[PDB]
Amino acid sequence: GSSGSSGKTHLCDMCGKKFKSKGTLKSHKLLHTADG
Ligand SMILES: [Zn+2]
What's the superkingdom here? Predict the structure, then answer.
């Protein structure tokens, strides 16, 4: 809820999407930022 979370997730601080692994969250964060 608005006052606090429950359970556990690998949460994106950039868009607010929630993931089931740090590997899945990392594979998602490549879409926000990458080297070039
Ligand atoms: Zn994200």
Answer: Eukaryota
